[PDB]
Ligand binder design. Structure first.
Ligand SMILES: CSC[C@H]1O[C@@H](n2cnc3c(N)ncnc32)[C@H](O)[C@@H]1O
Length: 270
């Protein structure tokens, strides 16, 4: 079972336009939260732009597919920008997708603050295309230690099978962000840690399915896809993305890498 991975440098809408309906199982989405100067030629706000790829994202997702959207809740009101709430409010009015979960990524370290509570969180909005979305909870359960696992086993009030499988990790994930010394770092300023992406890939996609990321950034999605046995399509508008993607590979089982949007199909084949 060899997996295929395609990558390229191009705009997110050009990527989405080349993918057929219901062909992707999971989309990893960590988008820019501000439009470009030139975007003022056709839009008057952030959602005017974002709604285009949000609609395409839903179109390419299969009936059992999902999209995980990273974002914060600190939008300051600047024209042309927004946050995760801007997207959620838009989705509530115009999309039939279901918000399966609003996950809180609670990281340990951060900047200090004297005039407010120091920020230690980022959100992940998990939208499912339909009520029949795929979910592999057991693949992400957190096991109990032998001592606790034995303590619950003796409690006949509890189902032993549930004890054996582990606990639901909940919708609050306490995971560290990458540090300036991390081995995963490739140079991208907002690089996401593999651990967070791994949990999303394991729980929201099945082995051999396609994971898509059109704001690929560091290319961490491809590295995780490969390690987890999924196929992937990763694109980014920045030329430097190719360099990052190649670096992710060095960090790395049968898989094939293919460059070029003309080859997206290689990663869509089941
Ligand atoms: C994961 S950080 C967000 C990423 O989105 C990329 N990006 C910004 N605007 C676009 C766009 N219109 N199409 C594709 N990628 C984009 C940026 O280059 C960055 O690496």
């Amino acid at each position: 079972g060899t997996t295929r991975h395609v990558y390229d440098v191009c705009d997110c809408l050009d990527t989405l336009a080349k993918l057929p309906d219901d062909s992707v199982q999971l989309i990893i989405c960590d988008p820019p939260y501000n439009i470009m100067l030139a975007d003022w030629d056709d839009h008057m706000d952030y959602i005017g732009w974002a709604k285009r790829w949000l609609a395409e994202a839903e179109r390419v997702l299969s009936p059992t597919g999902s999209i995980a959207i990273f974002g914060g809740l600190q939008y300051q009101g600047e024209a042309g920008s927004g946050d995760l709430i801007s997207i959620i409010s838009h989705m509530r009015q115009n999309s039939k997708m279901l918000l399966a979960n609003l996950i809180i990524w609670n990281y340990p370290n951060g900047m200090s603050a004297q005039r407010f509570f120091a920020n230690r969180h980022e959100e992940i909005a998990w939208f499912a295309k339909t009520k029949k979305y795929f979910f592999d909870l057991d693949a992400v359960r957190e096991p109990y230690d032998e001592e606790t696992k034995a303590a619950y086993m003796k409690d006949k009030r509890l189902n032993p099978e549930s004890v054996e499988k582990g606990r639901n990790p909940t919708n609050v994930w306490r995971m560290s962000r990458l540090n300036g010394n991390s081995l995963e770092r490739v140079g991208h300023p907002t690089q996401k840690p593999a651990a967070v992406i791994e949990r999303l890939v394991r729980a929201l996609s099945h082995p051999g399915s396609t994971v898509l990321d059109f704001f690929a950034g560091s290319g961490v999605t491809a590295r995780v896809a490969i390690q987890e046995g999924r196929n992937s399509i990763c694109t980014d508008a920045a030329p430097v993305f190719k360099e990052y993607y190649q670096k992710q590979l060095t960090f790395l089982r049968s898989y094939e890498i293919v460059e070029g949007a003309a080859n997206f199909g290689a990663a869509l084949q089941r």
